Design a protein around this ligand. Structure first.
Ligand SMILES: O=C(NCc1ccccc1)c1csc(N/N=C2\CCCc3ccc(-c4ccc(OCCc5ccccc5)c(C(=O)O)n4)cc32)n1
Ligand SMILES: O=C(NCc1ccccc1)c1csc(N/N=C2\CCCc3ccc(-c4ccc(OCCc5ccccc5)c(C(=O)O)n4)cc32)n1
Lengths: 141, 140
């Protein structure tokens, strides 16, 4: 119950500060930058590219390594911030299609796969290019 | 500082799911009822009351006890769902003033004080009045 209470407070204060357009922490600023970049990417750029969800055809039998081999296609010509945004959008799309197909049980493993891929394959590039601070500096507020 | 790749993932996926009417967490209906009740309270009903923030000057040296004794004033004549809503709004107002004062870092402290107050002073009343799912039935 105590953890739920904390979660209510955090949600309420985040929502209220966001509603006023206030940036209160580097973490909040990174998350806001990513949300907005994903929205812009999905609206106006994603349809130009081959649909990576068509390569995975996620099932409850899909393993991390199958996700990883499909994501490697997105980074076949290297890492940039745009492709990192596209990676988040791809994960978001796997979750949305999972829930659309009455397989919400996949949502938690998709999140773990995304974390694993970021930590294993993108973290060195992120640090080399000024960390998430630079992402916010170029694409945030 | 964003010192967690997993936190960015969970945040982004929560957002993307919400845009399709789907929920990351089970607390989703309460969060949506509390945000809407907060917005509604602040837009007109709040204007009737003395501004409780004028009694607090939150700095890195302010004790939890100072916050606790000002918040108690909300519940002087009992706990009800509206006063719980007002408590959250009050918390939100404190955070906005904290950022405006260049004390952004105190937002997380205020969050910690609110969760502490909620757990000590309000959790018993909440349990004894049908929990958050009643709040959702009334304000959702
Ligand atoms: O979500 C996805 N699919 C599901 C879906 C749902 C609904 C509709 C369509 C598809 C998804 C995300 S991704 C993707 N395929 N992309 C691939 C295919 C494999 C190879 C590949 C190779 C490079 C790139 C890529 C992606 C983004 C890129 O930049 C984005 C710039 C930007 C940033 C912020 C906001 C707007 C725009 C770039 C680039 O410019 O280098 N290059 C992308 C794919 N599919
Ligand atoms: O955020 C606050 N202040 C900063 C601020 C910013 C901008 C503008 C004005 C103030 C704030 C939240 S609070 C407050 N002071 N309120 C006090 C003063 C001390 C005594 C006190 C005592 C009872 C109540 C109270 C609060 C809410 C209440 O019900 C709300 C019902 C409702 C729900 C959903 C939507 C709309 C309305 C009630 C009640 O009717 O019981 N009673 C309230 C204060 N200040």
């Amino acid at each position: 119950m105590s953890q739920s209470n904390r979660e209510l407070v955090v949600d309420f204060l985040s929502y209220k500060l966001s509603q006023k357009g206030y940036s209160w922490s580097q973490m909040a600023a990174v998350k806001q930058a990513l949300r907005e970049a994903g929205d812009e990417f999905e609206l106006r750029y994603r349809r130009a590219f081959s649909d990576l969800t068509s390569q995975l055809h996620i099932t409850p039998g899909t393993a991390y390594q199958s996700f990883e081999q499909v994501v490697n296609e997105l980074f076949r010509d290297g890492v940039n911030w745009g492709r990192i945004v596209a990676f988040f959008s791809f994960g978001g799309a796997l979750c949305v299609e999972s829930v659309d197909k009455e397989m919400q049980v996949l949502v938690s493993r998709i999140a773990a796969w995304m974390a694993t891929y970021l930590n294993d394959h993108l973290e060195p590039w992120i640090q080399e290019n000024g960390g998430w601070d630079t992402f916010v500096e170029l694409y945030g507020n």
